[PDB]
Amino acid sequence: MPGQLDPSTGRRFSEHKLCADDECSMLMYRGEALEDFTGPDCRFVNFKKGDPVYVYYKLARGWPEVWAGSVGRTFGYFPKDLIQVVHEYTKEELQVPTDETDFVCFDGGRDD
């Protein structure tokens, strides 16, 4: 929060991300989207009800509950609330910190 906030731009989810592995290279769960949705926020994940998702990592305790993964041609962050775990590889939750530019958008993206 840089004093002001652009309504049309989302935030970098959370300061810490929970991963199935400390390098977040291993899948945690596999999910399916039980809700229609769009990710115009550049790094949001687009999906809709009936869209299979993969969840690489998730937020370290945050509401609205938000997760991250890849769906179709979109990969990034999205509301966990908008999907359902269709299966999981691990119950492991390693707390890896997020970089400020870990998930950013160049040319037409809020760095603030």
Q: Where are the domains of the chain?
A: 16-97
Experiment type: NMR
Instruction: Give me the numbers of helices (H) and strands (E) for the chain, helices first please.
Output: 0, 7
Buried b (16+ CB within 10 A) or exposed e, 50-71: ebebbbbbbbbebeeebbbbeb
Please name the residue that has the structure tokens 């590889």: 89
**Which residues 6+ apart lie within 8 Å of 25 measured at CB?**
56
The two structure tokens encoding residue 79: 């509301």
Closest by CA to 37, choosing from 74, 6, 87, is 74
Answer whether 70's CB lies under 8 Å from 56's CB. Answer: yes
Residue 95 in 3-state DSSP?
A: strand
Q: Report the C-alpha gap between 13 and 58 in whole angstroms.
A: 9
Q: Report the C-alpha gap between 31 and 89 in whole angstroms.
A: 11
16-97 CATH fold:
SH3 type barrels. (2.30.30)
Q: Which residues pair with 88 in a beta bridge?
A: 29
